Design a protein around this ligand. Structure first.
Ligand SMILES: [Ca+2]
Ligand SMILES: [Ca+2]
Lengths: 132, 28, 22, 132
C-alpha cells in the first residue's frame, strides 16, 4: 500500500546528493512511495531549465520510474483548498507548491517526507517524516 | 508478491545530475 | 440547467474579490 | 469532445456576476467545457476563506457539477515544466497557477478561455479566447 509522499525538496536533495540515509529508507519502503504530479512538474522544470537538460531529464525519469506519480485529482484539490483557507485565517501560509503537495498527501492519507518540519508542521491534519 | 520496479541502488549508484541542477528551486 | 445556476443562489460580494495567486 | 478549459479568472467572474453573455456561451458549449483541478482548488479556497463559506461552497459546487474537472496528470505536469522553462528563458513572469492551467490545456490540445488575455498571450503555443 502507498504510505509516503516525498516533498519536492526531498526529491531535489536526493537527486543532487544521493544520500545514504535516504537510500536506506527507499529500500525499506520500496513500492510504498509516491510523488504528486505537482512535484513532477517542478523536477521537469529543473531539468529543462538546466545547463544539461537531456542528462538531467534522464536522471529524473529514472527516479520517477521507480516509484509512483499520483495525479492531482479532485479530492487533492478540495483538500488543498480547505487547508489553504485554514492557513490564511491563521496567518501562516506555506508556498504554493508545498500547499498542493500537503493537500494531495492529505487527501490520500499519506505521510509527507520533508526536511521542512517548521513549515509543514503547521498544516492541519498532516503527518510528517524527515528522512535526512 | 509485490510488483517492484528497477532497483533503487541501480539508480542511486547511477551517474547523477549536473552540478547546476536546481541549485535553487524557485517557488514564488 | 445552467439557467437555474445563473438564476439561483448568489455568492457573497466578498467571494474572491481578489484572487490571491502567489 | 472537450474544446475549452476555463481559467480561474473566467470562473470567478462568472460566479460573481452571473453574466448573460457567458450563460449563452455555456449553453451553446455544454459538454465541451472543462476546468483543471488546479482551478477547482482555487475556487474551494475562495469559498472556504470567504465570509459566507457554506453558501459560497454551494455556489462553487453547483458550478463545477455542471462541467468536467480534469485531473492534473503526468502529461499536464510535463507540459507545464516545459513551458516554465521556455518562459524563464525569455524572463516573462506568469503566475504559478496560470502556468499550470496553460500546461494542462496544452497537454490536452484545449483552448484556454480567459478574461485576462495579457497574462496568457505570452505563453508559447497558447490558444486563447475571451468570453467577456
Ligand atoms: Ca518541499
Ligand atoms: Ca486562471
Amino acid at each position: 500500500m502507498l504510505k509516503f509522499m516525498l516533498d519536492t525538496n526531498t526529491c531535489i536533495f536526493t537527486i543532487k546528493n544521493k544520500p545514504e540515509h535516504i537510500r536506506e529508507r527507499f529500500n525499506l519502503n520500496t513500492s510504498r512511495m509516491c510523488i504528486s504530479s505537482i512535484t513532477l512538474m517542478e523536477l521537469i522544470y529543473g531539468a529543462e531549465k538546466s545547463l544539461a537538460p537531456e542528462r538531467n531529464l534522464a536522471v529524473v525519469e529514472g527516479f520517477i520510474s521507480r516509484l509512483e506519480v499520483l495525479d492531482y485529482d479532485t479530492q487533492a484539490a478540495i483538500h488543498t483548498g480547505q487547508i489553504r483557507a485554514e492557513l490564511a485565517r491563521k496567518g501562516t501560509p506555506v508556498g504554493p507548491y508545498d500547499q498542493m503537495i500537503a493537500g494531495h498527501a492529505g487527501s490520500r492519507g499519506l505521510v509527507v517526507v520533508t526536511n521542512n518540519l517548521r513549515e509543514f508542521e503547521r498544516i492541519p491534519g498532516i503527518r510528517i517524516e524527515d528522512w535526512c | 508478491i509485490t510488483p517492484v520496479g528497477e532497483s533503487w541502488d541501480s539508480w542511486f549508484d547511477g551517474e547523477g545530475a549536473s552540478t547546476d541542477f536546481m541549485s535553487t528551486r524557485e517557488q514564488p | 440547467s445552467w439557467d437555474s445556476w445563473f438564476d439561483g443562489e448568489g455568492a457573497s460580494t466578498d467571494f474572491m474579490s481578489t484572487r490571491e495567486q502567489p
